[PDB]
Enzyme design. Structure first.
Site, PDB file in Angstrom:
ATOM      1  N   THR A 155       0.851  -1.186   0.000  1.00 51.63           N
ATOM      2  CA  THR A 155       0.000   0.000   0.000  1.00 51.63           C
ATOM      3  C   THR A 155       0.886   1.234   0.000  1.00 51.63           C
ATOM      4  OG1 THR A 155      -0.208  -0.172   2.412  1.00 51.63           O
ATOM      5  CG2 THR A 155      -2.082  -0.955   1.052  1.00 51.63           C
TER       6      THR A 155
ATOM      7  N   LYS B  78      -3.493   0.278   7.270  1.00 47.54           N
ATOM      8  CA  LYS B  78      -2.129  -0.022   7.739  1.00 47.54           C
ATOM      9  C   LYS B  78      -1.485   1.182   8.436  1.00 47.54           C
ATOM     10  CE  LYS B  78      -1.355  -3.876   4.848  1.00 47.54           C
ATOM     11  NZ  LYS B  78      -1.388  -3.375   3.443  1.00 47.54           N
TER      12      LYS B  78
ATOM     13  N   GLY C 232       3.059   3.715  10.161  1.00 50.25           N
ATOM     14  CA  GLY C 232       2.466   3.184   8.953  1.00 50.25           C
ATOM     15  C   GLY C 232       3.398   2.141   8.402  1.00 50.25           C
TER      16      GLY C 232
ATOM     17  N   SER D 224       3.848   1.118  -3.040  1.00 54.97           N
ATOM     18  CA  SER D 224       3.580   1.248  -4.474  1.00 54.97           C
ATOM     19  C   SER D 224       3.141   2.693  -4.719  1.00 54.97           C
ATOM     20  CB  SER D 224       2.391   0.367  -4.898  1.00 54.97           C
ATOM     21  OG  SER D 224       2.598  -0.994  -4.738  1.00 54.97           O
TER      22      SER D 224
ATOM     23  N   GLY E   8      -2.722   8.160  -6.160  1.00 53.85           N
ATOM     24  CA  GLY E   8      -3.752   7.240  -6.589  1.00 53.85           C
ATOM     25  C   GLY E   8      -4.179   7.437  -8.026  1.00 53.85           C
TER      26      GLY E   8
ATOM     27  N   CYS F 114      -0.700   6.149 -10.149  1.00 56.09           N
ATOM     28  CA  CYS F 114      -0.264   4.781  -9.912  1.00 56.09           C
ATOM     29  C   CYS F 114      -1.420   3.804  -9.977  1.00 56.09           C
ATOM     30  CB  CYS F 114       0.422   4.700  -8.550  1.00 56.09           C
ATOM     31  SG  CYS F 114       1.265   3.154  -8.219  1.00 56.09           S
TER      32      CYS F 114
ATOM     33  N   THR G  84      -2.525   2.334  -6.600  1.00 62.26           N
ATOM     34  CA  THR G  84      -2.946   3.224  -5.534  1.00 62.26           C
ATOM     35  C   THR G  84      -4.345   3.687  -5.863  1.00 62.26           C
ATOM     36  OG1 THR G  84      -0.660   3.972  -5.403  1.00 62.26           O
ATOM     37  CG2 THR G  84      -2.287   5.218  -4.139  1.00 62.26           C
TER      38      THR G  84
END
Lengths: 180, 180, 180, 180, 180, 180, 180, 180, 180, 180, 180
Positions: free
Chosen positions: K6, K39, K51, K130, K164, K167, K170
């Site tokens: 993540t 997370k 995190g 990522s 997001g 990627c 994301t």
């Protein structure tokens, strides 16, 4: 074992059109031959901005072909672009080129590749080269959360600066060009 | 399994233009066939220095093509360079060549590659071949911290010597050529 | 999966010029088809010795081309060599050949490759083929510490013998040829 | 993923000249398409035996070219062989062929390859194909320790049989041809 | 990059039991450290012949273990063999060994491997090491077509000689041992 | 990416026993950290010469283990050697070591490897390390054709010099040690 | 470089249960050490048939463990099978084994692997080893289109024969075992 | 990443000639685009059956070329086959094709490949494509142990069905064609 | 995919001992996490300088172990170094570490590696990490041709600067530490 | 390193013919250049739907060629398709193209590839591009279990939506086109 | 073939400390299992934000260990960090983990890796997972050119959103946590 593609960022924001690019020649995994380079040039009577990453020769060749195609289709970026894309593809010598080309005029932004791609960002921003993604993220971010505050030229400047600070293949020797 | 590229260093310093190069033929991971070799030659009526690493044949072919292109564009290094670059690229026989070419005249230094690259050091120094990086570091160092003390020829000499002392593919059989 | 290159050693010592070579055909990692072979031949009216490792056909083709080039440039080994190198390179059928060629006359020794290399040993000795390095070391050693005692022919003989004794791809079926 | 080369053994013993070969088509790591095959043929008016392993098409093409070259040089196996070798090499379509060719007449035995090799066994025996080495060892052994007792045809027969019994790519469907 | 396994041939013929082996230490693709070596030894009161290819240490270790297992099972080659095989397998230090072991006594021949294999040739012949296949073919051939004429010792001698002549990793420094 | 093994040559000639070695630390494809190094040491009361290429730590560890094994078996090089070989093998930490070890005393020369090899040159010479083959050829050549003229120490000196002159991983900082 | 797995076919047809297997030891890409081998054995008081391809040692070890597990769970093939599978998996020494095991009794057929697999063919047929697929296809075909005509033993015989005729790693030395 | 070759089985049995084939288009490791496909066609006036696995385009091209060659050599399957093989080979566009072609008429069966192979099964059966081996084994089995009971068409039907049931790339959408 | 090793340069010049190092954290092919970092630290009561490239944890662990070993052997850099080397080697957790360690005191310079290397530059200069070679060349050059003019600290400063300017993994955030 | 193929789904259901496609340009492992793209176009007077994944240039080229071939064969999708396939194959510039083409008219659906494939789904559905399999599964599912409830356009819409939600290379910017 | 890490972004700006993270589970090259994941958690009495990308198990384990180490060193992030790093390194089970950990409290930001790295951004921003680089660029850009206008929470939100959008690994299911 090869030269790294320069980083070029192009943005259209609030009627203005700017295109930045770093200047860092990196041959091999980590060797730097020089800095201040120039692959962001003005074409079609300073009416269009064209940026091509890596290879001054290939840059030239492509600039010229687009310049020509531009006249053949009367400054119609769209057509000139797709036509250049068709040649790009069938050149089978340039077809090989990994680097991509960005062309933009007062009205629209366009990305062209040797694979025959002609992409138009619905976002108003395009970036290519080593560290293009970093620039793209920075640009998109600044334009969305600080657009009304900074200009296209300013954004293009920032986007590249941000990329240079993160990417080991991008430096601070930024070159900016813009269409009024 | 192949011959190692010789090391060539070119520097322009205080109006003088020198270009050194070692002479060591290394075939395979560690076999040495000979030493004293000569790939640094004078072209265009001793008006330009051209160095090509490895392959006397390819060296010749390229020297000639640049020699020609030089006349076709009236000694304009810049144009001759980019034109050579274009051919280099499309030769698809030389295009393969990993070695790079250095050309310089009384005014400017240039690096040319089969990938169509034509780079001009904003630093005044260029280096290529096995151990080119070592020479490049030495050259840049000496020019920046001892330039006013040593000449271009002297620097070119030192740069190569330093590279030969560190790189197992570079020796002390240095060849120096300079334009007055 | 392929035939191993024979081993050829060439040396010039005390006005005499000798060139030896083993004769062992090895196809594959370890299969031996035969022994007593002959790739060391006399050219240009027994005025020059030419040795080419592997492929009797390629050997022939190359010997002829050099023979020709030799006449075209009036027995000038140097020129004939570099010209042969140029063709070698552009043949793109022979260009592929991994094997190398050695040519020598009463005055000088030369090594020629399909990559366009033309090397002249400042040492007076050259060696190529499977086990050429072993021969080279033995030759250099004998010439430097026992030259005044043994002749060029004798050294060439020893160099190859030493290589045959160490290299599994070199045998004792030595062939010696020399120019008076 | 490809077809395995048949096994061919050729021997000259006591004025007689025999050439055997198995017949097993194996496609892939272990699939057998058929057995009784024939790549050992008589050429030049039953005056020469030619065997080529694998590819009936390539076999034909090569047999013909040699047949021709044989007439052009008046049944001189040696010349016809080296000439075929030269073409073999430059065909760059056959040059690819991994398989090798064996040619022999009443006087001599010869091995020809697409790499331009033309080998003559000083032993009087040649073998090629999947399991050629096994045949080679068997043949050499039988000829040296039981020659005066068994004929060339008999040896050729035994050599192949021995290879078939050991090599998973060689069977018992042996084909024998001989020159009186 | 590693030492090549010696070649060992074992044959039982007409009540006699002989085992030959070459002596050639080859480290790397083609370097020869020495010749006359001895990995064919007599065990269990000269009642059994054991040959292990490569590594004098591993040879010793294995000879001993078998010697032991031989007594533990009262000279029963079969049991001692399978037991050694089981240990071989689980040693996970020797299990790694690529080399194989041959053991034979007045009654039977056996091949043992670190993978837990225990093979008995229904042919009366076994061979292992660099060039074992060549020896195997030669041995099988001589025994089948000249058995009644030459003895086990003689065959073992010939088989190895033939292998040495073909395999670049097998020489003529043959060692023969036999049980009466 | 790793350090290159130093070159060590050991020869026994005319009752004298000398062992030479260069001193060149090369990390990576071509980087030289230093020169004058020492991996050739005297053990067992200056009664034995031991040379190990690369890793001063591993060198030490091995020297000690052999030193010990030497006492445990009362200066019997042969036994100490094979025992060290057995440990070498099972250490599975040193077993990894690519480098090899040479040990020799007034009577014999021995080569030991982590794979459990213990080789004794029937030639009287051993060499190991980057460029050991070159040294080996030189040594063998000089001993066979100039032995009666030069001593063991002299040969060892020459063998290394010759290797240093050819191998890019061997220098002239030679270290010689000998047993009276 | 390794020994090929024998081919084993097991079929249950019309109340009868037969299991066949060829006997061919193939070491390496194509070397055959022997033929008539036996890896198909009767266990649990001739109440079950167990076949394991390759490695007589591993065969033994596994047969025993299953034999044991068979008693511990009172001849319940199913449980014994899954338990053996669990050990198989965690043995991490046998876990490595590529070969698979077939076990069957008067009621059911089962396939067990080192990966912890326990498969029961809903088809009544199982096959494993080099050429197991061929046998499988032959078996399935014969049973479906000629079952009522041939017995389980006959089918098992045919299935293997067919495999041997196609697979270069399967021979005609078939071994058949069946439960009444 | 590519389309899987369909499975085609051809058999000649008791004067009848049938050729079956499945119809399953599998692109990639496991994607199925469709089923019922047809690559088994009748040529030369329904006088010959031709099956080509995969690529309807390549199928067409080849069918046509054979059709033509068939007329040029007056329905002589043998010649037409070898000629097609020669073209196949030199097409260097089709030469690439991994798929193989099967042609048969009232008298004989033939297999043709782009590598210039022309194989005639001495068995009367041929099979190609994903799962051709399975079909081959089934066909061979049924013909040998149930021939007098089932016809060529029936066998072809069964062979394919068996293949479809085992191979994940072969289905039950069988296509049968036969010559009276 | 991993963090790049920082660049550290250590030089002893004219009784002074300086050690520089850049500060650039590069994770992956080109991502920069931060700059100004510190891996060049003072140990043994500011009596020694230790630089370790990459991993602050590993840096710490090693600094400590050497610090300790330093006291155990009474500030004897040499011994402490070799002992640390031995542990380094056997740690088999640190043994893995690719990075190297540099230690120096008022008298000598030393390089230590996890492979058990302990090198002492006869040159008075050492360099390690991404771009250590560039620094090494610059340092050697400046010390040889401008030593009497610039100090150890100054050279260390320049060497790193030169490396930073060429290596994409070395920056200008230089850290200098020196022993009086 | 390349642009990901868009996802296109085509379905014919209840007399209606719809074709959807997402619009997501992904260059490299995870970079997104833009979204809303259009590779699903209407041809032959809005009488046919053609979708080609990736490359607007290649898309154009192919659309045109099919458009042409469509007229040349009077709107016969089948013929035009196979003809296009033949050209596709021999273009050896487009032959390279990994992307596939979907063409459909009021009567039938067709899939065409550069390998010369022309597939017609007996299912009435086709899908290609990054995530085409997901779309294919969703489409097949919805059509079989909810056909009578949702239309072709609706299904095409859903199929793509489902793919976009699962495939990281497919988004929600769906484009739908249908023939009445 | 594995789950994608993540994306987590952490920034400290104007006394506030925020940490965002997306929620997208991607297994394999492009399969999405779910979205909204968590997370990014609060530790040490909501006094610190931690995190960890990917693996809820590993996340937990690490959070706990740091939580503990935090108390053992009395909330001293710095120490707790380096100590965790040391364990991380030696765990040799977690040492394997490619994912990285970010920990921050009211005063400082820290990045920890299984390689024993503990980095503190002199920039005030950190990002991992990522698409961490994209977030990093966006964050850095927004903070430098719009800091005074947007808060830390706002920036963290934007940085992730930007990541997001670019990627493919994301998404927009962002989770934000902050320390007052």
């Amino acid at each position: 074992s090869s030269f790294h593609a320069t980083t070029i960022f192009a943005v259209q924001h609030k009627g203005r059109s700017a295109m930045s690019g770093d200047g860092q020649v990196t041959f091999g995994q980590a060797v730097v031959m020089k800095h201040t380079a120039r692959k962001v040039r003005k074409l079609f009577n300073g009416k269009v901005l064209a940026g091509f990453a890596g290879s001054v020769a290939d840059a030239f060749t492509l600039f010229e072909k687009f310049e020509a195609k531009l006249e053949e289709y009367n400054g119609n970026l769209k057509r000139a672009a797709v036509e250049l894309a068709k040649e790009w593809r069938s050149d089978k010598v340039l077809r090989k080129l990994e680097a991509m080309l960005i062309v933009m005029n007062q009205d629209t932004l366009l990305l062209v590749s040797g694979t025959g791609e002609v992409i138009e960002p619905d976002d108003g921003i395009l970036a290519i080269g080593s560290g293009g993604n970093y620039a793209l993220a920075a640009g998109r971010a600044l334009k969305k959360h600080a657009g009304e505050s900074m200009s296209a030229s300013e954004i293009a400047r920032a986007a590249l600066e941000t990329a240079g600070e993160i990417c080991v293949y991008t430096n601070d020797q930024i070159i900016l060009e813009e269409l009024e």
